Amino acid sequence: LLLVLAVIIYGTAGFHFIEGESWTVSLYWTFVTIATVGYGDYSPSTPLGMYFTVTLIVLGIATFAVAVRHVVICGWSESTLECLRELRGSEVFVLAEDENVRKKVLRSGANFVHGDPTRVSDLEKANVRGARAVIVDLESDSETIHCILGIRKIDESVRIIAEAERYENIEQLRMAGADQVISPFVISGRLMSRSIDDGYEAMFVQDVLAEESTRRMVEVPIPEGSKLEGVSVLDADIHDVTGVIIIGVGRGDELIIDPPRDYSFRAGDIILGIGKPEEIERLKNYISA
Amino acid sequence: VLAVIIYGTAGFHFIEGESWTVSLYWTFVTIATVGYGDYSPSTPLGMYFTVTLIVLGIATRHVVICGWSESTLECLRELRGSEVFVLAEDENVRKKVLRSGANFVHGDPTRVSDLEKANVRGARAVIVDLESDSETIHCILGIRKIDESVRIIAEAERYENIEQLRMAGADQVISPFVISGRLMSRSIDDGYEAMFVQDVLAEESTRRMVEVPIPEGSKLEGVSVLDADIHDVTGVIIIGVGRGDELIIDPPRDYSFRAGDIILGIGKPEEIERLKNYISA
Amino acid sequence: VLAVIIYGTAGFHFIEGESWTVSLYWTFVTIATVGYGDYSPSTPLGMYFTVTLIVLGIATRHVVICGWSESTLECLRELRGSEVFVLAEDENVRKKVLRSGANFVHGDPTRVSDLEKANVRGARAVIVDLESDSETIHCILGIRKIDESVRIIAEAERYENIEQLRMAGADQVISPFVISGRLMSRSIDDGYEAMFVQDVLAEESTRRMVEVPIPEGSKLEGVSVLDADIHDVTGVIIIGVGRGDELIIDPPRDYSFRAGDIILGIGKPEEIERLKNYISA
Amino acid sequence: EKANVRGARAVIVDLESDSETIHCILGIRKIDESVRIIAEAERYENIEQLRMAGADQVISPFVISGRLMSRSIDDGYEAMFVQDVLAEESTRRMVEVPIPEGSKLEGVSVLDADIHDVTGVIIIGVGRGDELIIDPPRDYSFRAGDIILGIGKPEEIERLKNYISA
Amino acid sequence: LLLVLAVIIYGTAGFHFIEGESWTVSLYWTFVTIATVGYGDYSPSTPLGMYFTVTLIVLGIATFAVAVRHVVICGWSESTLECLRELRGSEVFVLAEDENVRKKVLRSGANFVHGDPTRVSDLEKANVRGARAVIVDLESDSETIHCILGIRKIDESVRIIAEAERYENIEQLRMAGADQVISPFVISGRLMSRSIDDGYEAMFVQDVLAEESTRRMVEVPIPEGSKLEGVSVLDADIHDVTGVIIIGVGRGDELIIDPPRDYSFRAGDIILGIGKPEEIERLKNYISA
Numbered sequence A, E: 001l002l003l004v005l006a007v008i009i010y011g012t013a014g015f016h017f018i019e020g021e022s023w024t025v026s027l028y029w030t031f032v033t034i035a036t037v038g039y040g041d042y043s044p045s046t047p048l049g050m051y052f053t054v055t056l057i058v059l060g061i062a063t064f065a066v067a068v069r070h071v072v073i074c075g076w077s078e079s080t081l082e083c084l085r086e087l088r089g090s091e092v093f094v095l096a097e098d099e100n101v102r103k104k105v106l107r108s109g110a111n112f113v114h115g116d117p118t119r120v121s122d123l124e125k126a127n128v129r130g131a132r133a134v135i136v137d138l139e140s141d142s143e144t145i146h147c148i149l150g151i152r153k154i155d156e157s158v159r160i161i162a163e164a165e166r167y168e169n170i171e172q173l174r175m176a177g178a179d180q181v182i183s184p185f186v187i188s189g190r191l192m193s194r195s196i197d198d199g200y201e202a203m204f205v206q207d208v209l210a211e212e213s214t215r216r217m218v219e220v221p222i223p224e225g226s227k228l229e230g231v232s233v234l235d236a237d238i239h240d241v242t243g244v245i246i247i248g249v250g251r252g253d254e255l256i257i258d259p260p261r262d263y264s265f266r267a268g269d270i271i272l273g274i275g276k277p278e279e280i281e282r283l284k285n286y287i288s289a
Numbered sequence B, C: 001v002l003a004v005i006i007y008g009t010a011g012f013h014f015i016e017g018e019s020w021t022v023s024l025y026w027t028f029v030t031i032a033t034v035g036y037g038d039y040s041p042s043t044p045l046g047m048y049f050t051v052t053l054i055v056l057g058i059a060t061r062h063v064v065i066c067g068w069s070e071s072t073l074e075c076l077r078e079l080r081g082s083e084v085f086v087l088a089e090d091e092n093v094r095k096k097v098l099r100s101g102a103n104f105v106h107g108d109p110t111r112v113s114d115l116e117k118a119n120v121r122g123a124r125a126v127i128v129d130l131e132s133d134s135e136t137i138h139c140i141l142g143i144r145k146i147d148e149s150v151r152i153i154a155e156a157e158r159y160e161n162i163e164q165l166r167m168a169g170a171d172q173v174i175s176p177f178v179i180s181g182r183l184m185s186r187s188i189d190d191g192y193e194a195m196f197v198q199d200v201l202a203e204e205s206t207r208r209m210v211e212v213p214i215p216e217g218s219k220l221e222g223v224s225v226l227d228a229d230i231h232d233v234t235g236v237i238i239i240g241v242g243r244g245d246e247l248i249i250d251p252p253r254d255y256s257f258r259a260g261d262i263i264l265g266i267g268k269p270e271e272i273e274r275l276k277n278y279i280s281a
Numbered sequence D: 001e002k003a004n005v006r007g008a009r010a011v012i013v014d015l016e017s018d019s020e021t022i023h024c025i026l027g028i029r030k031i032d033e034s035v036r037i038i039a040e041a042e043r044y045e046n047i048e049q050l051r052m053a054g055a056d057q058v059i060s061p062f063v064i065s066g067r068l069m070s071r072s073i074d075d076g077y078e079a080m081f082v083q084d085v086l087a088e089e090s091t092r093r094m095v096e097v098p099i100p101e102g103s104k105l106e107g108v109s110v111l112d113a114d115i116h117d118v119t120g121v122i123i124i125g126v127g128r129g130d131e132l133i134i135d136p137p138r139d140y141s142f143r144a145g146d147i148i149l150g151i152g153k154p155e156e157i158e159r160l161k162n163y164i165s166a
Ligand SMILES: [Ca+2]
Pocket: A077, A079, A137, A138, A163, A165
């Protein structure tokens, strides 16, 4: 305020009478003397402004040297790192409290916001409010849950997907307002048991989720006025017809796995199938208006 | 930089045949990389020197808060607008304290040299919450050894050492886990105690809780607390009246208002006036 | 700085009526605080701009060592003179490694991306001592997944996992607490074993311990180790001879020198020659 | 004391930190001030302070290790030799054989004695007291009390023992 | 070596032909362009040296901005801090390994040497070799002892005064080469016991050592050819005569406390007495040749 404003009010005053120059001449030089620019279009011609040019080079050079749509990921874990790797190409904001993490998050194609996902001021700082969804994995299930309540107190209908570390608190996470709860040690622990005899379960689950498999696992919805509305799941012979396996069909926020042969396709239904990309089309078409 | 300025004004006096006001006036424009140009190396004897003087020249009242806790953070939030100095030993804290409108003094409130460093001596009061009651107490004795009558308000962590804090010279001892612990018990059945205590203290409640003093020669001196019908008269509830460094809560109907008495009442701000006036000379 | 240079060459083209080579040539002398002076603000329209462009302008083969331990520090001390790259994860270590004549690569030898970062792929050999035998082993598998035939020499901390280190792909496993632990036992009675082992390995001893190979078509091929009287002949003691990736210590008198054989002997440097010559084609 | 350092064949010391190792040493000296003390050094920097404190023999496994590391870049044999002579499995054992008073070999030349040929036992060095000469010159003169340091089959460690007696 | 030497070999080359100037003209300007000095006595007059003055302002300004007698105390403890407070006025070098300590040591009137008193290279770094004495208090008696052996391996006769933390290792410190071993918890622990009944012992010991007491505790030596040589300690009535109390007399590297009445004052003897400073003179004189 009045630091480099006192040496600029002292350098334009001692260059007005000490070198007989205008107010636009004393000031225009003081900015070239303190900025060590020194065009030269106004040098000390009188030893009265030369002892002043030396004093406005100390109090002047010193005072001018030091007076001069998206997806929010809360937490930075291997899980949420593995997720960021699959959102490459979308606007992602990682909010976490360790600063060092910043490099990894940047290199991993997402924006870093240093903050504490349980503090709301920081949720805000990452525009939780209005984001496609918020994905939460904090170090401890309590912190994860705390962060969730924070978000709810903001966009109280934003989509919240969270990871549960203990099974014991799967529901408290949902209670706190998590929309979808993923529990990787449960999934893992089970595939472990299952993989004692033969590997295929652990093989299927891990592979459908990896891009390399030709077969991709997709949700295809049943659009209003569908060639298939009220139609039987069996009457529709979808597998044969389109090749796409129907593993289940999502009526809302539930999913019926392997629906009975007599299932009736309401529109708005979500179809969950694995199949070659060529035949995910066939199903999309054999389904339209 | 006084050896390169004594070397640059010496090799610009004989090597370029200039005055003492000419060699020095240029050396400050050569080392400062300003370079007006009103004195450039015209002789290759001052040009090999202008290169050497470009390397060796260019290269060449208030309130003190001891401790920073959530309590003392919650206090700083209510002194916004007064000169406060927070003295604590963790440096990182400095940002939060600054953003919170108070001045930071990095130091160790138990070390006196640092109490000094924050002008404990002559401050309205010193407020102490250190991490451990022993440290709190230590800090207190420190202050006493300086302004031995400054007002000292301190927070006690254990109940067990409420008096040792007062012993050490704390004037007022606040114990938030006791207050909390009790409101807990009391809030089992119904919330109102905890509600009252927390709300009177929060600004939002229209009713504010104030101390009004009985000035010398008061329309109310020697007057009965009952004879004065203060509630009815002014609306201000009288919850207690402070005769000195004690406070009588809900004084008997026959209480006699000496002047200098402190009246402790809750009431709308409009009627805190009514009480102020109905009380004056 | 490309917006202030596009703003300073634009407000010095119309505000001082100069070319594009004139507005730009001055903006680089104004922002760089050089200020030759060959283009100063002559119009107060480019003088209020020279002040604004003074603020926004002035303001605007080798060997990889995985792990850094006293062992691998004692090794770097003996490779002084070769291209060495130390890869370790503590940054502070960087000074010691640099002063010790090797290049530092900050990284985590178990992470492959960092093995890469130090060009494990194609290095004379990789030497591994990580803090824990598991990490050591992990680092080894990393390397194999890259140059799967690079030479890997690793130090084992427990004996129990000497083979797991070899299993993981360590070519040569050195176990200094075993060597030490044994010399301990052996040095109870007399010092000489511990003396021998430590001294042959230290430069100061005139006698150096060298491997001399038996070149194809050797004056000594098919020749008996005894028939060759190598000690007497050359002075060089034959302590063992390495037939491939094994070493026979104190070969029987009737050992038959195939070429490609490695001779392991101690002897004065003058007579390491004598052996080299008495051995050639 | 509680472990009878006082009068023990030798005391062997490896404490967690070289300072503690050294301290332990001085303790022992303050008791049996001539008991044999063999100690391990963690830094090289304090090899001598350990000896200073009274360690008779100082073993430094990270130096031995660190060197074999360097040496094993090119070929494994040094590291192989050192580790194997020390392990029982190798038929060849590395032994010290002393030259008893009135030895068939006293004043005899190390070369004149053709010990290798004669007995098969390699002479890697000979310990004249508390020093060891490695690969002694051909003209070494076997005083009695000398310690012979050699590798060789157990059968021929005898041959050397006998070819050496009174 | 060849970084800012390639832009100075490039700026004196493109200012020789591009502005037709000498070798002393291209170089003399390049040092004023890269140093952002800019006298102006050689500005780009040709647009061929103006596109070069812009290129020698980037590769030139960037490459010239980042390419541009005594007493040793080993250890910094409250003890050795309390000692430094009493050597104010002598050349002291504190060698310790925590850097932060540096400020306290400086403010306390001694020079700081950051190092590890057990590493010899650092003992060296503080000129242990040839210092009046070396004073050692390291954090742990083992480290203290280690540091001592280090010093011995250097000036093997320098005076070494060290503090012992345990009593158990008082002698190992002396063994390692400590000349004088001070054990403050022993001194303290004893005065504790002694101060149960009455304070005077703890009072005497602490006060004789503090300046404020008029009475100072001094060692006065018996110079060769002393008015007092062979003289009896009793025959000399030193107390009465001079007022100075004789608490003991140091025959070499031992000290006899309260010598028998029949003690015979050899010269070179050290007299240890308390007394007013006026009468420490009287004793000095009543003692000379
Ligand atoms: Ca997790």
